[PDB]
């Protein structure tokens, strides 16, 4: 109270006021946009959505006593909002419940009164007109309820709030859908509770009823129009099944649904991450890394968040299985410090022709290799180490014999050197030929590529792609 | 006060980092320690070399009573004599500050610098302080404050000076040598050697010649290189004074490769006796070797190693494995054969090489306009 | 059945039974390792070492899927090799297999010398012949340059 | 020293005289424009970064 109690009066009043005004003028701005000119594609819906993910998750994590976030439920309990006198009477109430909670205290939350704060604000003459107002006021309790992390009769209050939200979600999507379409926010709101619906089960058990319902929402969506609902719902079905260390790879293979067509530059970044994992595990490496790159290079506007850490951690692994490897520690991070050392020690022993240091590093760093989430390195690297030597020699020597390459590759067998190169030519490591007469192994002959119909075909890729960059960028801008 | 101070920086460096080299560096710097009143910046050189020795309190009371005699002077000056700007107060303040650079540590100097910098309205005084920042910033190799004061000097001081800046031409390249910029900026502004007197502004001149000759063989292959290093005169005489360096140049130019290794081995072994040779002794060697192979493999499409076995040096399997590392490094666009014994090269005939460049840069820009395209349009 | 993609994607269910113990999974994953290294000898030396019964119908197909790939690798621009090269590329000292390959395919033994036909290409390209598709590409450019304003 | 246009063989002791393409000015002037185009895309990049 002398030190800590004096800095108790400053935090409520103005953040109580200025956070309340911004969501009011947006919700009033969304309502007029819902009533007239539903073309709200470049409207304030997404930027308010980008506020709630960022600010309201870092501004507050507790239910904010002195009635700051805890006062939102006794404020919004008496809300009807049907007619023009009825709205003006409620606008009289909006002023009065802020003025009372600003001056004095009204109704306090003691981390247990979650059922009175969710059923009576849902009730009391509430209508199905102001749909984002209702969906926001149910989604905003879900954040401090999880961020409290007390786990004392809390899961059921999470669960009932989700089911009520889903009941309000189905009541929107089926009855009176005439020009409201709140799917642009409801997808993430569904995604946020499902992250909590996964995590709460992940504290205790698996999750499968969440996915059967997620099929059912995917069954009741995807017939209307793809409006970035199906995109995120495809990922939420996909993330758990990859997280399960059993199967469901073939379910994603037959999943003929790759057409989200837009992602707000948010989903397609991480959508291209997951399908890169699956093309990598299905031994299709060339298409994997080029879209693993396309995911990483898309959105670097992130200050050490972790998926950027994870795509970069995998991309260097699929590069090592191909054979080439550029620098990776050039953008060092305080989070990269515990991840830059094992892979750099890994790519050191791979590119060199050593084995005992390689096994020592493999024995030392296997605990991290399991904690990262790839196990196939144990089988796919011993092909790489034995082919790194033959690729470097075939790149260097134009014509090396088998008896020399057998002694150079510490092999002690001059009989399988024909078999290694025959595996190397078949697998596409290098284009050579074995003259099986005394052991002549030749290489390429011609270097002319220029007047031999190479350049035009790449050039036809450059023209057709950039005019498509052009015309899409033409249509995307002349909106007025 | 900061005149014999680059030599000290070598003797600190020569004694500290190699431990086998500890015989004479402790002999001459200990004489430099007990002289010059160097009483702040020697604790590490005493903690990293020897245990201790009592001459310490003797010099502490002398530097203190001198500083106090210097402290009582400029306070009486500013209490009796009222002149500001650049006055008798001012050259008292820099004489304190130069006493701080010679005797004390950097921290009291830099706060006396920023104090006396705001008491400057001329440009030569402001040039002098930035001369002092850069001189001590090289002494403690600080790559932080050099990023500021140089930009402060070139933009705000050097618009009125005239040929006072060849010294700060030389200090820039000196940072570029201890940095990685040892390629084309380093040799370009080392090309004018029109100062030989050695001063506060100019270091040892023979060593300046050896630096500007060692770096002028990486910038440029032979684009009439010989006009600037052989047809020059003032560079030519001082390398005519030095038989080792002059032998190294003619071996590279006239293609005497046999002695070239012997000259290169002498240099790299001598390179260890330096204070700024750190990004050199793993880089300068292999860059010259790959430059020596570049001009030798030029003009021979079907060269054999049987000519390399006596005209170039000795050995066969050593040259083979070194070429096999260098091709697999990614450079030296050639191919080697073992059983025909023909190092058959593949040089692009100036149309592939134009095409190889245009296909990289177009892909790098198409990536750059893709990545820009996805940031925009939501 | 030559499903290497299905091979690895199955290997996700076992946490720590692959390295620690359980030869019944350790024996196929060591076998896949030996196909990726390049030691055909280590395959058939390990064919006579089975933990449970013999795995006979598995190694018979494993013999079957190797020897045709070996036969598919050799039917190339090679012309003739003696019996000793087919004693090094293939195996056993005069089995019915060389008679099996003689009746099915060629590899006909004559005067101690086989004969393999050349299976290369001989296509005499001219490549100014696909000049219509090039003019098609030039026109569709200026189509896409114009025609939408 | 570029006073002569040819190549040598050590394996065969064979002097071979060849020639060069004189034309290079089309692609050289082309690749410099790529550098100009690269910086303006960088200059639109940080502009679109700073303000949407």
């Amino acid at each position: 109270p002398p030190g800590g109690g004096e800095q108790e009066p400053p935090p409520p009043p103005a953040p109580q006021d200025v956070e309340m005004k911004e969501e009011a003028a947006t919700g009033g701005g969304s309502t007029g946009e819902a009533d007239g000119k539903t073309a709200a594609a470049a409207a304030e819906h997404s930027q308010r959505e980008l506020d709630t993910v960022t600010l309201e998750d870092i501004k507050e994590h507790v239910k904010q006593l002195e009635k700051a976030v805890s006062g939102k439920e006794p404020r919004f309990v008496l809300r009807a909002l049907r007619m023009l006198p009825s709205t003006s009477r409620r606008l009289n109430h909006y002023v009065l419940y802020k003025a009372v909670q600003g001056f004095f205290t009204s109704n306090n939350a003691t981390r247990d009164f979650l059922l009175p704060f969710l059923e009576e604000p849902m009730d009391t003459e509430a209508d199905l007109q102001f749909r984002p107002r209702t969906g926001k006021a149910a989604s905003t309790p879900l954040l401090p309820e999880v961020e409290a992390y007390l786990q004392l009769l809390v899961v059921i209050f999470m669960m009932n709030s989700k089911r009520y939200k889903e009941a309000q979600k189905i009541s929107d999507d089926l009855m009176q859908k005439i020009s409201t379409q709140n799917r642009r926010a409801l997808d993430l709101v569904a995604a946020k509770c499902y992250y909590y619906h996964a995590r709460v089960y992940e504290f205790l058990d698996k999750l499968d009823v969440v996915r059967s319902f997620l099929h059912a929402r995917l069954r009741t969506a995807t017939l209307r129009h793809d409006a970035d609902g199906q995109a995120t719902l495809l990922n939420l079905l996909l993330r758990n099944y990859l997280h399960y260390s059993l199967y469901d790879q073939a379910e994603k293979l037959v999943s003929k649904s790759v057409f989200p067509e837009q992602a707000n530059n948010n989903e397609w970044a991480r959508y291209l991450y997951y399908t890169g994992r699956i093309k990598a595990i299905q031994l299709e490496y060339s298409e994997a890394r080029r879209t693993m790159t396309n995911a990483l290079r898309k959105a670097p506007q992130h200050t050490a968040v972790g998926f950027k850490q994870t795509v970069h951690k995998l991309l260097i692994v699929v590069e090592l299985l191909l054979g080439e490897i550029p620098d990776r520690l050039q953008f060092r991070q305080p989070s990269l410090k515990r991840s830059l050392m094992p892979y750099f020690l890994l790519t050191q022993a791979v590119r060199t022709g050593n084995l005992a240091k390689f096994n020592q590093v493999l024995d030392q760093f296997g605990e991290k290799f399991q904690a990262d989430g790839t196990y196939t390195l144990i089988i796919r690297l011993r092909h790489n180490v034995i082919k790194t030597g033959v690729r470097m020699i075939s790149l260097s020597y134009s014509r090396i014999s088998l008896a020399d390459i057998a002694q150079k590759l510490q092999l002690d067998s001059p009989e399988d050197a024909e078999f290694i190169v025959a595996k190397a030519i078949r697998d596409g490591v290098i284009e050579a030929s074995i003259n099986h007469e005394k052991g002549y192994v030749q290489s390429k002959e011609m270097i002319d590529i220029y007047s031999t119909r190479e350049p035009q075909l790449a050039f036809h890729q450059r023209i057709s792609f950039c005019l498509d960059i052009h015309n899409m960028s033409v249509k995307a801008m002349r909106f007025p | 006060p900061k005149n014999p101070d680059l030599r000290i920086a070598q003797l600190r460096f020569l004694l500290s980092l190699p431990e086998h080299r500890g015989d004479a560096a402790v002999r001459d710097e200990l004489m430099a320690a007990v002289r010059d009143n160097n009483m702040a910046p020697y604790y590490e050189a005493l903690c990293k070399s020897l245990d201790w020795q009592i001459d310490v309190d003797l010099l502490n009371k002398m530097k203190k009573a001198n500083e106090d005699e210097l402290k009582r002077l400029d306070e009486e000056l500013e209490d009796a004599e009222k002149n500001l700007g650049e006055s008798e107060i001012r050259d008292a303040m820099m004489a304190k500050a130069e006493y701080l650079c010679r005797i004390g540590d950097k921290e009291g100097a830099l706060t006396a610098f920023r104090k006396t910098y705001d008491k400057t309205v001329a440009l030569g005084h402001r040039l002098d302080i930035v001369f002092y920042l850069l001189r001590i910033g090289l002494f403690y190799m600080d790559n932080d404050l050099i990023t500021r004061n140089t930009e402060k000097a070139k933009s705000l001081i050097e618009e009125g000076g005239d040929w006072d800046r060849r010294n700060r031409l030389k200090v820039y390249q000196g940072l570029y040598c201890v940095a990685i910029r040892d390629f084309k900026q380093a040799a370009e502004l080392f090309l004018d050697t029109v100062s030989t007197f050695t001063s506060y502004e100019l270091m040892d001149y023979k060593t300046f010649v050896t630096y500007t000759v060692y770096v002028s063989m990486i910038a440029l292959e032979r684009p009439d290189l010989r006009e600037k290093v052989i047809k020059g005169a003032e560079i030519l005489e001082v390398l005519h004074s030095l038989p080792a360096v002059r032998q190294y140049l003619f071996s590279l130019y006239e293609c005497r490769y046999s002695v070239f290794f012997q000259s290169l081995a002498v240099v790299e072994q001598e390179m260890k006796k330096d204070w700024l040779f750190a990004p050199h002794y793993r880089y300068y060697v292999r860059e010259m070797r790959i430059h020596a192979y570049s001009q030798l493999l030029e003009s021979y499409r079907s060269l054999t190693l049987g000519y390399m076995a006596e005209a170039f040096g000795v050995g066969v399997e050593f040259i083979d494995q070194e070429l096999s590392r260098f091709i697999a490094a990614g450079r030296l666009h050639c191919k080697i054969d073992k059983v025909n014994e023909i190092v058959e090269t593949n040089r692009p005939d100036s149309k592939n090489w134009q095409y190889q460049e245009t296909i990289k840069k177009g892909d790098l820009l198409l990536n750059r306009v893709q990545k820009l395209s996805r940031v925009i349009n939501m | 059945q030559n499903r290497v993609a299905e091979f690895h994607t199955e290997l996700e269910r076992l946490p720590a039974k692959d390295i620690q113990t359980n030869v019944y999974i350790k024996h196929p994953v060591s076998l896949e390792q030996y196909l990726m290294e390049g030691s055909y000898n280590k395959v058939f030396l390990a064919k006579g070492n089975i933990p449970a019964e013999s795995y006979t119908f598995f190694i018979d197909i494993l013999l079957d899927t190797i020897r045709d790939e070996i036969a598919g690798c050799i039917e190339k621009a090679y012309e003739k090799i003696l019996f000793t090269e087919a004693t090094r590329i293939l195996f056993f000292n005069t089995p019915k297999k060389m008679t099996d390959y003689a009746k099915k395919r060629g590899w006909v033994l004559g005067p101690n010398n086989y004969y393999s036909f050349a299976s290369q290409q001989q296509k005499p390209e001219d490549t100014t012949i696909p000049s219509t598709e090039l003019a098609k590409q030039v026109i569709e450019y200026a189509r896409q340059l114009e025609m939408i304003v | 020293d570029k006073k002569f246009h040819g190549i040598l063989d050590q394996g065969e002791g064979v002097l071979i005289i060849f020639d060069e393409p004189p034309v290079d000015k089309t692609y050289e002037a082309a690749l410099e424009t790529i550098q100009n185009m690269s910086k303006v895309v960088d200059s639109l990049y940080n502009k679109a970064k700073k303000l949407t």
Binding site: I463, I469, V474, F479 | - | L145 | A30, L51
Partner: peptide, 30 residues
């Protein structure tokens, strides 16, 4: 390289200006 680069970046610069001009009137109409 004249079509695919020079015509492309102009359309991108035309995209930047109108979307800024679209959002400036949209934030200042009311």
């Amino acid at each position: 390289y004249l079509a695919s680069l020079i015509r492309s970046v102009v359309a991108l610069h035309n995209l930047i200006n109108n979307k800024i001009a679209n959002r400036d009137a949209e934030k200042k109409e009311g």
